[PDB]
Amino acid sequence: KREHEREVIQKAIEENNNFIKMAKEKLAQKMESNKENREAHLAAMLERLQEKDKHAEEVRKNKELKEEA
Amino acid sequence: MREIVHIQAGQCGNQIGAKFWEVISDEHGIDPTGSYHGDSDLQLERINVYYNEATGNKYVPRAILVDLEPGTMDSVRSGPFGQIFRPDNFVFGQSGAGNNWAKGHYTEGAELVDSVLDVVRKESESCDCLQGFQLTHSLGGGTGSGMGTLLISKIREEYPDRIMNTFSVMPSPKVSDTVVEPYNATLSVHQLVENTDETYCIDNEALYDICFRTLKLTTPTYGDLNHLVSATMSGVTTCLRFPGQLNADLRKLAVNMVPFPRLHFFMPGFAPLTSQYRALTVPELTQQMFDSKNMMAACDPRHGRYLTVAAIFRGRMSMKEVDEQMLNVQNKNSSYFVEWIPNNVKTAVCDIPPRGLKMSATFIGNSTAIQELFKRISEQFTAMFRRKAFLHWYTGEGMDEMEFTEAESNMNDLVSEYQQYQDA
């Protein structure tokens, strides 16, 4: 019976620690995944804006070519 | 010098335990300061059974007060007889048990149990000849139920050859604090089946009914309920506290009352129960003593059979008439006493009456009808356990559902065992 009493309280400790461990790991996964997703969305937005700048440079360069002729 | 060590655990155990020491201190002439102011040597003849003698002719109760909360024990220390208890015998935690058997038995009470055993060891070392222990507790809460049975198991481990006696308060939906009381009671009953020699089953359902139906109290309180317990506890311990020949010690009481080791749960009864100056005759005491309305277990004696009976009469009365009335009840209702235990009714008489009464009678019955109490708890247990309701309070403390299943089976075996000897 003393052995069973030790096993019960150790089981309660193990489950409480496992709950803390699962909560910490799940949150860290979510915060890291969210950080990557938001940065990816911002990176895609900036890349499109940079492509607009590249298009504008092409347009302005195209005007100089025709002005020479 | 056959000493008894008293332990009270939890809210109910301490509140009932405090009233018990208040009642018997008055009977033995001990004032709240521990000084003797009686007028009869019969009060001090067996005073060492429950009291230690200190410097200055002071009588200190051999009582250990245990709780996982300081609240109730603080009230006891501030109560009428609070100062009479030994200050070092107050062992208490702070977290509490939350009406949870697992907390009292496995997690919260485990942290505190060793310090209680140190006080038990200190009290036992000074005993010339220790009879054993008496415990007051409830089975429906967490501390008295969970930690109380933990204490019993550990005390039996350290003192295997001593008698374990308990006053166990059974839960009831009529007087209920939480829905988990059937869980706590069922878990505790199996501990009592294995690790106690004598258990007085005090049913809060019976105490409420007596206060309501008999004493005409429309709104009974715990104080009213504990008044019945105090009177019952004084009566059942009369043979231990005063000179006598019958059931004078715990072991001899167990030999007379327990024909089979697991069937040691007693139905206590008290008379008179008056809602008051009228003198009560010896025939009236005997009729009320055996009446179901004066039983503290809420079991109908006519639904079962008496294995053994102990009767105690207190006051200046005709012992010849007591014998006639006791033989009259047995001879007029012999169908309710088992025929395979001859002369199973033993009667004792004490000259000193309880406070406020000229005549009193205390009933101690080992009846197979006590199975009704265990059936009632079992039905309430199963109604929730079949849906695993409220189990998370216990699995959160490390317990598994299998332990509940085993406790359920153990009490059903106890019920079946009582039914075996009711038909034999």
Ligand SMILES: Nc1nc2c(ncn2[C@@H]2O[C@H](COP(=O)(O)OP(=O)(O)O)[C@@H](O)[C@H]2O)c(=O)[nH]1
């Ligand atoms: N007769 C009686 N029963 C009580 C008293 N206090 C609590 N109870 C019962 O005991 C159960 C609750 O147990 P409790 O002692 O309060 O829990 P614990 O302090 O953790 O051991 C419930 O079934 C109540 O009906 C009391 O003063 N007298």
Ligand SMILES: [Ca+2]
């Ligand atoms: Ca702690």
Ligand SMILES: [Mg+2]
């Ligand atoms: Mg309580």
